[PDB]
């Protein structure tokens, strides 16, 4: 599923991401835009053999099991394919665990390079919510 901007903002709000660990909703919408272009089916392979999955591009080296990242962890206790669903619940619940690990949203390279320090509330302007 490819989300609309306000459609995704509403879904993340419903799932409790607005101000989660201090990150306003616009941060999460900005991260999703540049990580995945709002596409729940996005995948990208990394140099170390791991793969990033879903609308927030969660990585198989630590957070999910894809059966092909040897010596990796599965800290969200979930198959990576669950991160590709049109239902974003699994992605949001796993992202809550990531952002709570000490490094905040710096875990998402696109957020650090393209959202951090910008007017992130622009990403939810015009939305009803
Ligand atoms: Na893994």
PDB file of C-alpha atoms and ligand atoms in Angstrom:
ATOM      1  CA  UNK A   1       0.000   0.000   0.000  1.00  0.00           C
ATOM      2  CA  UNK A   2       1.180   3.519  -0.832  1.00  0.00           C
ATOM      3  CA  UNK A   3      -0.160   5.876   1.825  1.00  0.00           C
ATOM      4  CA  UNK A   4      -1.292   9.422   1.450  1.00  0.00           C
ATOM      5  CA  UNK A   5       0.524  11.955   3.616  1.00  0.00           C
ATOM      6  CA  UNK A   6      -2.425  12.869   5.842  1.00  0.00           C
ATOM      7  CA  UNK A   7      -3.691   9.290   5.707  1.00  0.00           C
ATOM      8  CA  UNK A   8      -0.393   8.056   7.159  1.00  0.00           C
ATOM      9  CA  UNK A   9      -0.250  10.873   9.701  1.00  0.00           C
ATOM     10  CA  UNK A  10      -3.690   9.854  10.976  1.00  0.00           C
ATOM     11  CA  UNK A  11      -2.678   6.198  11.207  1.00  0.00           C
ATOM     12  CA  UNK A  12       0.497   6.960  13.131  1.00  0.00           C
ATOM     13  CA  UNK A  13      -1.402   9.257  15.483  1.00  0.00           C
ATOM     14  CA  UNK A  14      -3.960   6.515  16.177  1.00  0.00           C
ATOM     15  CA  UNK A  15      -1.107   4.126  17.004  1.00  0.00           C
ATOM     16  CA  UNK A  16       0.467   6.542  19.477  1.00  0.00           C
ATOM     17  CA  UNK A  17       3.473   7.972  17.617  1.00  0.00           C
ATOM     18  CA  UNK A  18       2.700  11.671  18.090  1.00  0.00           C
ATOM     19  CA  UNK A  19       5.268  12.900  20.652  1.00  0.00           C
ATOM     20  CA  UNK A  20       6.458   9.344  21.312  1.00  0.00           C
ATOM     21  CA  UNK A  21       9.776   9.714  23.169  1.00  0.00           C
ATOM     22  CA  UNK A  22       9.479  13.424  22.373  1.00  0.00           C
ATOM     23  CA  UNK A  23       9.279  13.166  18.579  1.00  0.00           C
ATOM     24  CA  UNK A  24       6.350  15.114  17.168  1.00  0.00           C
ATOM     25  CA  UNK A  25       4.224  13.497  14.463  1.00  0.00           C
ATOM     26  CA  UNK A  26       5.886  15.435  11.623  1.00  0.00           C
ATOM     27  CA  UNK A  27       9.200  13.708  12.343  1.00  0.00           C
ATOM     28  CA  UNK A  28       7.664  10.282  11.731  1.00  0.00           C
ATOM     29  CA  UNK A  29       5.887  11.335   8.533  1.00  0.00           C
ATOM     30  CA  UNK A  30       9.101  12.939   7.238  1.00  0.00           C
ATOM     31  CA  UNK A  31      11.093   9.783   8.041  1.00  0.00           C
ATOM     32  CA  UNK A  32       8.569   7.584   6.224  1.00  0.00           C
ATOM     33  CA  UNK A  33       8.563   9.862   3.165  1.00  0.00           C
ATOM     34  CA  UNK A  34      12.309   9.672   2.638  1.00  0.00           C
ATOM     35  CA  UNK A  35      12.818   6.094   3.823  1.00  0.00           C
ATOM     36  CA  UNK A  36      10.127   4.448   1.743  1.00  0.00           C
ATOM     37  CA  UNK A  37       8.126   7.059  -0.214  1.00  0.00           C
ATOM     38  CA  UNK A  38       5.138   6.022   1.954  1.00  0.00           C
ATOM     39  CA  UNK A  39       5.228   2.506   0.401  1.00  0.00           C
ATOM     40  CA  UNK A  40       4.638  -0.366   2.839  1.00  0.00           C
ATOM     41  CA  UNK A  41       6.205  -2.822   0.355  1.00  0.00           C
ATOM     42  CA  UNK A  42       9.581  -1.077   0.069  1.00  0.00           C
ATOM     43  CA  UNK A  43      12.701  -3.215   0.520  1.00  0.00           C
ATOM     44  CA  UNK A  44      16.390  -2.368   0.168  1.00  0.00           C
ATOM     45  CA  UNK A  45      19.408  -4.642   0.516  1.00  0.00           C
ATOM     46  CA  UNK A  46      22.416  -3.399   2.507  1.00  0.00           C
ATOM     47  CA  UNK A  47      26.099  -4.075   1.854  1.00  0.00           C
ATOM     48  CA  UNK A  48      26.407  -6.353   4.901  1.00  0.00           C
ATOM     49  CA  UNK A  49      23.708  -8.671   3.525  1.00  0.00           C
ATOM     50  CA  UNK A  50      20.903  -7.367   5.731  1.00  0.00           C
ATOM     51  CA  UNK A  51      17.718  -5.891   4.254  1.00  0.00           C
ATOM     52  CA  UNK A  52      15.540  -2.913   5.255  1.00  0.00           C
ATOM     53  CA  UNK A  53      11.765  -3.537   5.268  1.00  0.00           C
ATOM     54  CA  UNK A  54       8.599  -1.500   5.082  1.00  0.00           C
ATOM     55  CA  UNK A  55       7.458   2.053   5.460  1.00  0.00           C
ATOM     56  CA  UNK A  56      10.131   2.790   8.076  1.00  0.00           C
ATOM     57  CA  UNK A  57      12.837   0.592   6.503  1.00  0.00           C
ATOM     58  CA  UNK A  58      13.496  -1.534   9.567  1.00  0.00           C
ATOM     59  CA  UNK A  59      16.675  -3.604   9.310  1.00  0.00           C
ATOM     60  CA  UNK A  60      16.967  -7.386   9.574  1.00  0.00           C
ATOM     61  CA  UNK A  61      20.381  -7.324  11.273  1.00  0.00           C
ATOM     62  CA  UNK A  62      18.703  -6.430  14.582  1.00  0.00           C
ATOM     63  CA  UNK A  63      14.960  -6.158  14.422  1.00  0.00           C
ATOM     64  CA  UNK A  64      13.263  -8.881  12.396  1.00  0.00           C
ATOM     65  CA  UNK A  65      13.898 -12.344  10.961  1.00  0.00           C
ATOM     66  CA  UNK A  66      14.057 -12.781   7.183  1.00  0.00           C
ATOM     67  CA  UNK A  67      15.802 -16.165   7.118  1.00  0.00           C
ATOM     68  CA  UNK A  68      18.833 -14.878   5.225  1.00  0.00           C
ATOM     69  CA  UNK A  69      20.781 -12.544   7.570  1.00  0.00           C
ATOM     70  CA  UNK A  70      23.077 -15.006   9.379  1.00  0.00           C
ATOM     71  CA  UNK A  71      24.097 -14.153  12.919  1.00  0.00           C
ATOM     72  CA  UNK A  72      21.423 -11.466  13.266  1.00  0.00           C
ATOM     73  CA  UNK A  73      18.906 -10.689  15.998  1.00  0.00           C
ATOM     74  CA  UNK A  74      15.123 -10.455  15.919  1.00  0.00           C
ATOM     75  CA  UNK A  75      14.496  -7.899  18.650  1.00  0.00           C
ATOM     76  CA  UNK A  76      10.932  -7.109  17.544  1.00  0.00           C
ATOM     77  CA  UNK A  77      10.240 -10.897  17.440  1.00  0.00           C
ATOM     78  CA  UNK A  78       8.571 -10.704  14.057  1.00  0.00           C
ATOM     79  CA  UNK A  79       9.160 -12.000  10.505  1.00  0.00           C
ATOM     80  CA  UNK A  80      10.364  -9.118   8.350  1.00  0.00           C
ATOM     81  CA  UNK A  81       7.523  -9.795   5.918  1.00  0.00           C
ATOM     82  CA  UNK A  82       5.091  -8.581   8.594  1.00  0.00           C
ATOM     83  CA  UNK A  83       6.634  -5.132   8.124  1.00  0.00           C
ATOM     84  CA  UNK A  84       5.359  -5.058   4.531  1.00  0.00           C
ATOM     85  CA  UNK A  85       1.647  -5.275   5.400  1.00  0.00           C
ATOM     86  CA  UNK A  86      -0.866  -2.572   4.520  1.00  0.00           C
ATOM     87  CA  UNK A  87      -1.528  -2.600   8.286  1.00  0.00           C
ATOM     88  CA  UNK A  88       1.259  -0.522   9.822  1.00  0.00           C
ATOM     89  CA  UNK A  89       0.748  -1.828  13.360  1.00  0.00           C
ATOM     90  CA  UNK A  90       3.785  -4.122  13.296  1.00  0.00           C
ATOM     91  CA  UNK A  91       6.023  -1.401  11.844  1.00  0.00           C
ATOM     92  CA  UNK A  92       4.884   1.178  14.397  1.00  0.00           C
ATOM     93  CA  UNK A  93       5.268  -1.188  17.354  1.00  0.00           C
ATOM     94  CA  UNK A  94       8.780  -2.144  16.239  1.00  0.00           C
ATOM     95  CA  UNK A  95       9.739   1.493  15.604  1.00  0.00           C
ATOM     96  CA  UNK A  96       8.706   2.291  19.189  1.00  0.00           C
ATOM     97  CA  UNK A  97      11.264  -0.238  20.354  1.00  0.00           C
ATOM     98  CA  UNK A  98      13.975   1.180  18.066  1.00  0.00           C
ATOM     99  CA  UNK A  99      13.488   4.823  19.015  1.00  0.00           C
ATOM    100  CA  UNK A 100      13.574   3.775  22.705  1.00  0.00           C
ATOM    101  CA  UNK A 101      17.036   2.189  22.508  1.00  0.00           C
ATOM    102  CA  UNK A 102      19.185   5.243  23.265  1.00  0.00           C
ATOM    103  CA  UNK A 103      19.818   6.823  19.849  1.00  0.00           C
ATOM    104  CA  UNK A 104      16.368   8.251  19.203  1.00  0.00           C
ATOM    105  CA  UNK A 105      15.445   8.738  15.606  1.00  0.00           C
ATOM    106  CA  UNK A 106      19.107   8.926  14.568  1.00  0.00           C
ATOM    107  CA  UNK A 107      18.645   5.195  13.848  1.00  0.00           C
ATOM    108  CA  UNK A 108      16.965   6.318  10.583  1.00  0.00           C
ATOM    109  CA  UNK A 109      19.677   7.751   8.336  1.00  0.00           C
ATOM    110  CA  UNK A 110      17.156   9.549   6.139  1.00  0.00           C
ATOM    111  CA  UNK A 111      15.615  11.259   9.164  1.00  0.00           C
ATOM    112  CA  UNK A 112      19.042  12.440  10.347  1.00  0.00           C
ATOM    113  CA  UNK A 113      20.031  13.763   6.926  1.00  0.00           C
ATOM    114  CA  UNK A 114      16.732  15.109   5.575  1.00  0.00           C
ATOM    115  CA  UNK A 115      14.368  15.741   8.504  1.00  0.00           C
ATOM    116  CA  UNK A 116      16.435  16.603  11.590  1.00  0.00           C
ATOM    117  CA  UNK A 117      16.659  20.356  11.978  1.00  0.00           C
ATOM    118  CA  UNK A 118      13.961  21.153   9.414  1.00  0.00           C
ATOM    119  CA  UNK A 119      10.395  22.399   9.812  1.00  0.00           C
ATOM    120  CA  UNK A 120       9.020  18.889  10.238  1.00  0.00           C
ATOM    121  CA  UNK A 121       5.559  20.140  11.160  1.00  0.00           C
ATOM    122  CA  UNK A 122       5.148  21.068   7.478  1.00  0.00           C
ATOM    123  CA  UNK A 123       4.603  17.343   6.878  1.00  0.00           C
ATOM    124  CA  UNK A 124       1.270  17.354   8.722  1.00  0.00           C
ATOM    125  CA  UNK A 125      -0.025  20.782   7.723  1.00  0.00           C
ATOM    126  CA  UNK A 126      -3.387  20.757   6.009  1.00  0.00           C
ATOM    127  CA  UNK A 127      -4.264  17.414   7.613  1.00  0.00           C
ATOM    128  CA  UNK A 128      -7.373  16.982   9.707  1.00  0.00           C
ATOM    129  CA  UNK A 129      -6.035  15.544  12.955  1.00  0.00           C
TER     130      UNK A 129
HETATM  131 NA1  LIG B   1      17.345 -10.755  11.972  1.00  0.00          NA
END
